[PDB]
Design a protein around this ligand. Sequence first.
Ligand SMILES: *[C@@H]1O[C@H](CO[C@@H]2O[C@@H](C)[C@@H](O)[C@@H](O)[C@@H]2O)[C@@H](O[C@@H]2O[C@H](CO)[C@@H](O[C@@H]3O[C@H](CO)[C@@H](O)[C@H](O)[C@@H]3O)[C@H](O)[C@H]2NC(C)=O)[C@H](O)[C@H]1NC(C)=O
Ligand SMILES: *[C@@H]1O[C@H](CO[C@@H]2O[C@@H](C)[C@@H](O)[C@@H](O)[C@@H]2O)[C@@H](O)[C@H](O)[C@H]1NC(C)=O
Ligand code: NAG
Ligand code: NAG
Ligand code: CA
Ligand code: CA
Ligand code: CA
Ligand code: CA
Ligand code: CA
Ligand code: CA
Ligand code: CA
Ligand code: CA
Ligand code: CA
Ligand code: CA
Ligand code: CA
Ligand code: CA
Ligand code: CA
Ligand code: CA
Ligand code: CA
Ligand code: CA
Ligand code: CA
Ligand code: CA
Ligand code: CL
Ligand code: CL
Ligand code: CL
Ligand code: CL
Ligand code: NI
Lengths: 428, 428
Amino acid sequence: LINLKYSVEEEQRAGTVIANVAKDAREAGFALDPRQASAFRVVSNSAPHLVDINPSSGLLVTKQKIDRDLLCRQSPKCIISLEVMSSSMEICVIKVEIKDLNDNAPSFPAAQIELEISEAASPGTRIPLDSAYDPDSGSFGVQTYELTPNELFGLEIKTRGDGSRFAELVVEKSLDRETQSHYSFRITALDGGDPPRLGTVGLSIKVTDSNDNNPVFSESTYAVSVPENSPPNTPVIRLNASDPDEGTNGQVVYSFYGYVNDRTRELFQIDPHSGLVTVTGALDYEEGHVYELDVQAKDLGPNSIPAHCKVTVSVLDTNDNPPVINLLSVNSELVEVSESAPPGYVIALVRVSDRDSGLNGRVQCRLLGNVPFRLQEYESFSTILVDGRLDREQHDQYNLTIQARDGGVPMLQSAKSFTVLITDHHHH
Amino acid sequence: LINLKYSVEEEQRAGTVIANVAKDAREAGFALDPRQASAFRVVSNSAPHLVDINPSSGLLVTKQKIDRDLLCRQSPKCIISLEVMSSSMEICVIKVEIKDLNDNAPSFPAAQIELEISEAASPGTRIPLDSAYDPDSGSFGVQTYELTPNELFGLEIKTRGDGSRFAELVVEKSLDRETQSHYSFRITALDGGDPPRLGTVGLSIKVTDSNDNNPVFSESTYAVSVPENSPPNTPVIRLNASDPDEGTNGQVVYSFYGYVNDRTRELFQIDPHSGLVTVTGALDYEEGHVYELDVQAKDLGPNSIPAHCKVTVSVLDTNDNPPVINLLSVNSELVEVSESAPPGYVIALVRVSDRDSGLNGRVQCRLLGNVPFRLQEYESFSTILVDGRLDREQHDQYNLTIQARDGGVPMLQSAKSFTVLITDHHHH
Ligand SMILES: *[C@@H]1O[C@H](CO[C@@H]2O[C@@H](C)[C@@H](O)[C@@H](O)[C@@H]2O)[C@@H](O[C@@H]2O[C@H](CO)[C@@H](O[C@@H]3O[C@H](CO)[C@@H](O)[C@H](O)[C@@H]3O)[C@H](O)[C@H]2NC(C)=O)[C@H](O)[C@H]1NC(C)=O
Ligand SMILES: *[C@@H]1O[C@H](CO[C@@H]2O[C@@H](C)[C@@H](O)[C@@H](O)[C@@H]2O)[C@@H](O)[C@H](O)[C@H]1NC(C)=O
Ligand SMILES: *[C@@H]1O[C@H](CO)[C@@H](O)[C@H](O)[C@H]1NC(C)=O
Ligand SMILES: *[C@@H]1O[C@H](CO)[C@@H](O)[C@H](O)[C@H]1NC(C)=O
Ligand SMILES: [Ca+2]
Ligand SMILES: [Ca+2]
Ligand SMILES: [Ca+2]
Ligand SMILES: [Ca+2]
Ligand SMILES: [Ca+2]
Ligand SMILES: [Ca+2]
Ligand SMILES: [Ca+2]
Ligand SMILES: [Ca+2]
Ligand SMILES: [Ca+2]
Ligand SMILES: [Ca+2]
Ligand SMILES: [Ca+2]
Ligand SMILES: [Ca+2]
Ligand SMILES: [Ca+2]
Ligand SMILES: [Ca+2]
Ligand SMILES: [Ca+2]
Ligand SMILES: [Ca+2]
Ligand SMILES: [Ca+2]
Ligand SMILES: [Ca+2]
Ligand SMILES: [Cl-]
Ligand SMILES: [Cl-]
Ligand SMILES: [Cl-]
Ligand SMILES: [Cl-]
Ligand code: NI
């Protein structure tokens, strides 16, 4: 029947006087018989330990200090319903409202918020953040959030229901670890207070890597030279591909990328994890001058995009073949010369070869001894001719010996000995 | 001394007359005397089994059919140097060159060329392709390559080592497996002849996957309701994230996200590999009405961009609290009523509550027995009043029993019995 409303701020000194219920009850129509200061008693009340009416004085006192933010959380109104009974079965419902105060500033449970975002995070990617804690009601509760001004990240606030706000992170534009790996920001939450209260958190963003870089060689093509007969495990060329990715994604492994049936496979090797290309087989300039290696560098991660380069290994000619002498008699027989052989008569023809090339293969010849014969060398063919008088007695037979010498370093020689004999007049 | 150069095509019939060595040499100055088949002899020649000069006739004839592509491979020139010696130690060097013919068409050894390219292949990255095989020399060897006209891939021709033509593949525009995984193209090799000869092979291109799709929920937020006291392991909600990637990259694993020290953690659980959110603890509407679950779906593998959604799980109120009856007398004494009690005089006040809500919390009261008393209902307080004649003798004491019943399903009752006594004059 009878209703009395009141209101008082929260967190007030315990034992506060809200109002004299006797005054406003009599004024409003109560059966307060003169009954030794005990006319009415509280039937039941929402908060036994917080508010109490005095049967003696007939006054509303706060039993303890009121913390509205615990009773009603964010509920818009905070009323303690308290019902009193009179001496003769009469009732007065009394509803006291607890006005909220901005005694709480928004709070973050974590001192810092560390996050990991892949550099491949599409712009628009959003990450829900732990909303701050402000137990005040509505207006005095958390209202907005702010992040350190930047271009890469933004904050978007949404209200699930009846405010109760939370704010998520948003990648605003493309990230890239290889440019900036870490970010450090500051988030502050703000409540709707006359002098608004704030909370703070440090926001560390570690940009997780993505295998978005492929190995790359300094050059597409290379050219190397190797002297023939280079011993096994001789350094040909050490390739250096670069991958700026992180860990496995940035680790390069070299290997050969060609068909597997060619001589190259057997001749050379590569150190896959280091990049050293060495000679393992028989390299002979005389057999082949050049070899083509197709090397691929590959990263150890997902979406492994390999990169290739071609190395032209030219073999170099060392002077490792002696000059070969070959005597040519007309009838492949013992060289006989007549005594009366006029100066300059040809005896036998000589030919020299050399499997090398250049100055290593080019030859020059000599005729040893004091013998009466000269060796005039012609283009690629040295001829022996008679020089002097031939006496059957003073010299019946000679043992001509030809030397051949190349122009390599170290130079090489060769010797060939053939016997010549002198005749009177033989018609064989 | 004397040089005679000649030329002849390959693959000619056997016993061909290249040139008349006797005539050419004699005109060129050589010991051509009329002798019994003994004017000169071939000293040595590059290929004995291929070409030979005969002193009897004096002609440069070929022994068999010559295949230049075997002798000199791609070597630019193919010369056979025959050395001839005359009667009087005179020499005529002869070099016969073998002109190449397009008797070989370029051919590929494999039927198809299998390739694997990551959909993340940046436009411009190239994959060296296996060069075709044509043993002809220079112009007549492999010259250019051609692929099926398309937009995604192109061909690039390059020259590595003094010829040795090769063509690598080049990506023209971005690939995407989630749109098209396999490609079927045709490559043809061509040689440099008037009627060019070709070879062909099928080129299968498999687009290897890249984790370039993140899990995605159907909607941004969800809302579900669950009756309180739902037993452990009850279906709350079935989340369903989608990821079109391949294998691991497309496999979603759901899990809980948010602050760790939260009530929710103990109440619910989620099936990580399936996405079923089941209840683990006891839910009580009377304690809390709503709960906020933050679920994240993330794919296994690299560059895991997770997706989040918020589930607002609202609890439902079951009628699981009985209506509490509570009678309160003036001084909490045995209820005494005066004999001369006029109809409608108040005896004792009743108050009933119910911790439930809605019709589950709404109560209605009853008075049992034939007793001379009424229970007239007020808002929140049922009053007991006198309705009959109170005779000390006919009825000295009553044992009034009040029932209370809520409007839930199944409805709940409660009973409270107090004794009333009748008296004429009270002096205390
Ligand atoms: C025709 O003449 C040559 C030249 O021999 C020499 O002529 C002079 C220039 C002096 O050097 C003399 O000492 C000698 O006769 C003969 O060639 C040489 O033949 C000798 C004997 O056969 C070879 O001796 C050998 O040498 C090797 C190492 O060089 C030793 O290991 C052997 O044990 C042995 O002593 C010699 O190598 C060879 N060449 C040279 C440059 O000395 C040739 O034999 C001769 N022919 C005839 C038919 O008389
Ligand atoms: C007072 O009465 C209580 C209820 O008894 C009930 O009486 C009728 C109306 C039915 O509801 C019947 O089912 C019950 O027996 C008793 O339980 C109680 O004992 C009585 N008081 C005393 C002091 O005995
Ligand atoms: C590759 O080159 C870079 C740049 O000069 C250098 O820092 C790095 O040490 C080189 N690595 C190898 C393996 O040569
Ligand atoms: C998710 O929903 C799709 C329909 O869009 C369905 O094909 C798929 O099977 C569902 N996922 C699971 C795990 O059942
Ligand atoms: Ca407070
Ligand atoms: Ca407050
Ligand atoms: Ca606040
Ligand atoms: Ca990058
Ligand atoms: Ca990277
Ligand atoms: Ca990489
Ligand atoms: Ca050699
Ligand atoms: Ca050599
Ligand atoms: Ca030499
Ligand atoms: Ca041929
Ligand atoms: Ca040919
Ligand atoms: Ca050809
Ligand atoms: Ca894709
Ligand atoms: Ca994909
Ligand atoms: Ca995926
Ligand atoms: Ca309950
Ligand atoms: Ca309930
Ligand atoms: Ca109930
Ligand atoms: Cl921004
Ligand atoms: Cl890593
Ligand atoms: Cl002819
Ligand atoms: Cl569990
Ligand atoms: Ni003789």
